[PDB]
Amino acid sequence: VETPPEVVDFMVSLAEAPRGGRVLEPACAHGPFLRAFREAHGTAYRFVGVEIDPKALDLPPWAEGILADFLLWEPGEAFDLILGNPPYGIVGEASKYPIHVFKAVKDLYKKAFSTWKGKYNLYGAFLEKAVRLLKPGGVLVFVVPATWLVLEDFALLREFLAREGKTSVYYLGEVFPQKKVSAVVIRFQKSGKGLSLWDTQESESGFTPILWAEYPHWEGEIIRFETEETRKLEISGMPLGDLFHIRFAARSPEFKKHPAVRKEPGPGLVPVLTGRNLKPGWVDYEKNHSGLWMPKERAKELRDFYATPHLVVAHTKGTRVVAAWDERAYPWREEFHLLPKEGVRLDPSSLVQWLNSEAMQKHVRTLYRDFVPHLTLRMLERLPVRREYGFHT
DNA sequence: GTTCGGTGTC
DNA sequence: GACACGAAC
Ligand SMILES: NCCSC[C@H]1O[C@@H](n2cnc3c(N)ncnc32)[C@H](O)[C@@H]1O
């Protein structure tokens, strides 16, 4: 799947290898990265491409092509430079996930990768594999989704990279015309330590990196675009997660099998609410977006907290904070559900106002840009709340 | 329990 | 661009 030439050129500009060095393109198909590196830096390297699909492998005679699953491949010797664009996707059942392998193959991947966590992703596994294949002081330059900067599934991967060498992350954003993904380039070197975060600007002449921040003692913490303002706001109030237990809605299959739940409206039945029912500062209790209906009073059988009016915050409205007080205490199939901790005093209307405020939207957009199409728990629990809105006694 | 999206669908 | 679900663990 194609990489824009300006992305390739940018990545090649970050790449290096010594004379006679071993240069690898994993998932290479026709080897556009090998070709670009050779054109830019010359011929005195050992070029290798690894590709699983015989129909796809189409390298020039000056490169060695290997037909293999890169994730399970064991070469005789490590590499000086590894570059390219790995495949992206979750391994799982075809009805829901795009990568389809025998369970036994998924088992080999889990055995192979110390960073594998949750559903994980091929791109995480490619990154780990590549790092393991680098000689000491070797370099990797990959373009991958930005999701690993922030997501829990990638916590082990971030800790692994922090531990194994030094990391530079260059934000590109949505640079693939046909693909819905916000991208970064990672340049990793198997020596030293620390993280450098870079923005980019694109011009006619390609991408130009702009240094944003440096974290010389990075240990795999979530990566964010921090500013003087984000810092200033964070120290102005209690993290939201110190004021509230944060829970998630019961999931669709739990409602679908529950004997109280119906697929048609009826006397005494209310809609099972989704994200579409959640608006800034109010809840649309009437419209049904889930296809599911149930008695309001039986909602507590799915989660005890559905019995109690409480704060609800959106998960799938992009990088935004959208909140409302569920005054009626309805069943929800989506969103975060925040229950105040013992001793917490709240002004719900004011807090909802603050969460929905322009200041709050700019805060989260600065920090997290468009890495993921969600406000995640790790973002939400860090939102700052001053004494006007909430107070822990 | 709750996570994630070479997103899904308008 | 608007505006957002179940297999996975
Ligand atoms: N480098 C372009 C994006 S990734 C798409 C390419 O990766 C190949 N590919 C996918 N999974 C692979 C794997 N595990 N090992 C080697 N090649 C793989 C595909 O056949 C395809 O040519």
How many angstroms separate the CA atoms of A140 and A79, rounded? 9
CATH second-level architecture of A224-392? Alpha-Beta Complex (3.90)
Protein-strand B interface by C-beta, 7 A:
A 1, 3, 85-90, 96, 98, 118-119, 121, 145, 147, 151-154, 176, 178-182, 246-248, 250-251, 303, 315-316, 372-374, 376-377
Experimental method: X-ray
Token readout for A26 is 């994993």
Q: Give the active site residue among A33, A45, A79, A86.
A: A86
Of A247, A248, A246, A255, the C-alpha closest to A299 is: A255
A85 as an active site residue: the answer is yes
A11, A34, A52: residue to mutate for ligand 1 pocket, most atoms within 8 A of CB: A52
Nucleotides of strand B under 7 angstroms from a protein beta carbon: 1-8
Name the 3-class secondary structure at A34: helix
Place of tokens 């998630």: A248
How many A from CA of A143 to the centre of ligand 1?
14
A79-84 and A134-145 strand pairing: parallel
Fold matches, A1-223 and A224-392: no
The helix or strand, by DSSP H or E, that contains position A202, with its residue range, turns out to be: strand A195-203
Q: Are A84 and A27 in contact (CB under 8 A)?
A: yes
A253 touches strand C (CB under 7 A): yes
Any atom of ligand 1 within 6 Å of the Cβ of A7:
no
Q: Does domain A1-223 have CATH number 1.10.340.30?
A: no
DSSP letter at A264 equals S
A277 as an active site residue: the answer is no
* CA-proximal residue: ligand 1, atom 20 (nearest): A53
**A64/B2 CA-to-C1' distance in Å:** 45
Q: How long, in residues, is chain A?
A: 393
Which residues, 6 or more positions from A253, have their beta carbon under 8 angstroms from its beta carbon? none
Of A279, A308, A376, the C-alpha closest to A336 is: A376
Interhelix angle A5-14/A32-41, nearest 10 degrees: 50
Dihedral angle of Cα A301, A304, A309, A314, to the nearest 10 degrees: -90
A86 as an active site residue: the answer is yes
Resolution (Å) of this entry: 1.7
* CA-proximal residue: ligand 1, atom 3 (nearest): A1
How many angstroms separate the CA atoms of A123 and A181, rounded? 13
How many angstroms separate the CA atoms of A60 and A74, rounded? 23
A176 as an active site residue: the answer is yes
> Per-domain residue ranges for chain A?
1-223, 224-392
